[PDB]
Amino acid sequence: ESADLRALAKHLYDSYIKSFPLTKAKARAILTGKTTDKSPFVIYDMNSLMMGEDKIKFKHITPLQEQSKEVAIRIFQGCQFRSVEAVQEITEYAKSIPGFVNLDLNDQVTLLKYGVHEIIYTMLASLMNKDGVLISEGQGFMTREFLKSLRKPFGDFMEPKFEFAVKFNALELDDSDLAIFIAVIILSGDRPGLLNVKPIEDIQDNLLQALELQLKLNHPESSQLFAKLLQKMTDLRQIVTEHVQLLQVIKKTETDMSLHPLLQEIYKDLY
């Protein structure tokens, strides 16, 4: 019944809020210039990037590190660090998706391994507009133009995420829609190396029913939004494979070797 699907949607939204403190709603308030109280520092070129450091450094140092390396490479390592934090946020969220924690632990690991990239881009869209991306928990904003301006291959590496975000954001999903959609992504029975596919597909079936009902209720005037959203997954996956290939080229063709070892530890048979 329908009430239990709403109950599931509400439980997911509650957990999603807990796992991911910078929500889309809060992110969109910051991106407009609404509630004008503490405007984020804008990084729009190399100079402001460096001045941006002594604005999350003048106080103290809690990030990926600071100025003693080429800037394109430091921006890329910053992204890596944040991706590693996001994987843990997603893992925590997964534990609240009904059925997930009762799965074979090996299948949990596999689902997370192949799901996090798709989730990272989905959730990155919430923090983006057409012109840039919120960073450091909404304290900073980095422009798309500056990310795009970074030397090959780093400039063309960033821009696909913005192209996707603009398309994806035009569906106008809110945090309640996204909580269920991320859960659907995670419980994909088609990931390579899964031992027990049937319970995963049974859980995803319940999540798909919950997502369909939420979109029908929340977006009544958006015809076939559910199918349009499922079709977005096809683009997400194509996009992640392109990202994974570009990561290899970068890994191969660059000087700096000091990665975050969640990347190297993951990525087994990721095409």
Ligand X SMILES: CCCc1cc(C(=O)c2ccc(-c3ccccc3)cc2)ccc1OCCCOc1ccc2c(ccn2CC(=O)O)c1
Q: Report in angstroms how near the CB of residue 243 gets to ligand X at its nearest.
A: 6
Find out whether 83 is annotated in a ligand binding site.
yes
**220 bridge partner residues:** none
Could you tell which of ligand X, a copy of itself, none binds residue 78, using a CB distance below 5 to 8 A set by kind? ligand X
- Alpha-carbon distance of 77 to 79, in angstroms, equals 5
**Six-digit token pair at 166?**
């603009």
Q: Which is nearer to ligand X, 9 or 82 (CB)?
A: 82
Look at the block and give the residue holding tokens 């941006």: 52
Q: Which is nearer to ligand X, 126 or 204 (CB)?
A: 126
Residues 184-223 that bind a copy of itself (CB under 8 A): 195-196, 199
- 267 is a contact residue toward a copy of itself (CB under 8 A): no
- 259 touches 80 (CB < 8 A): yes
Find out whether 117 is annotated in a ligand binding site.
yes
Find out whether 219 is annotated in a ligand binding site.
no
Could you tell which of ligand X, a copy of itself, none binds residue 11, using a CB distance below 5 to 8 A set by kind? a copy of itself
Q: Report in angstroms how near the CB of residue 50 gets to ligand X at its nearest.
A: 8
Could you tell which of ligand X, a copy of itself, none binds residue 54, using a CB distance below 5 to 8 A set by kind? none
Strands 128-129 and 41-43: unpaired
- 84 is a contact residue toward a copy of itself (CB under 8 A): yes
- 265 is a contact residue toward a copy of itself (CB under 8 A): yes
- Alpha-carbon distance of 37 to 225, in angstroms, equals 35
Q: Report in angstroms how near the CB of residue 15 gets to ligand X at its nearest.
A: 20
Q: For residues 57-77, b (16+ Cβ closer than 10 Å) or e, as one string? A: eeeeeeeeeeeeeeebbbbbb
Find out whether 108 is annotated in a ligand binding site.
no
- 117 touches 246 (CB < 8 A): no
Residues that bind ligand X (CB under 6 A): 49, 52-53, 64, 74-76, 78-80, 82-83, 86, 117, 120, 124, 133, 135-136, 142, 147, 157-158, 161, 243, 247, 263
- Alpha-carbon distance of 18 to 29, in angstroms, equals 19
Q: Measured in Å, how far apart are the chain's first and last C-alpha atoms?
A: 40
- 72 touches 151 (CB < 8 A): yes
- 103 is a contact residue toward a copy of itself (CB under 8 A): yes
- Alpha-carbon distance of 69 to 110, in angstroms, equals 35
In 3D space, the residue among 144, 207, 140 whose CA is nearest the CA of residue 177 turns out to be: 207
- 27 touches 126 (CB < 8 A): yes
Contact letters (x/-) for a copy of itself, 34-73, by CB under 8 A? Answer: --------------------------xxxxxx--------
**Which segments are annotated as binding site for rosiglitazone?**
80-83, 117, 243, 267
List of residues contacting a copy of itself (CB under 8 A): 11, 14, 17-18, 60-65, 81, 84-85, 88, 91-92, 95-96, 98, 101-106, 108-109, 195-196, 199, 261-262, 265
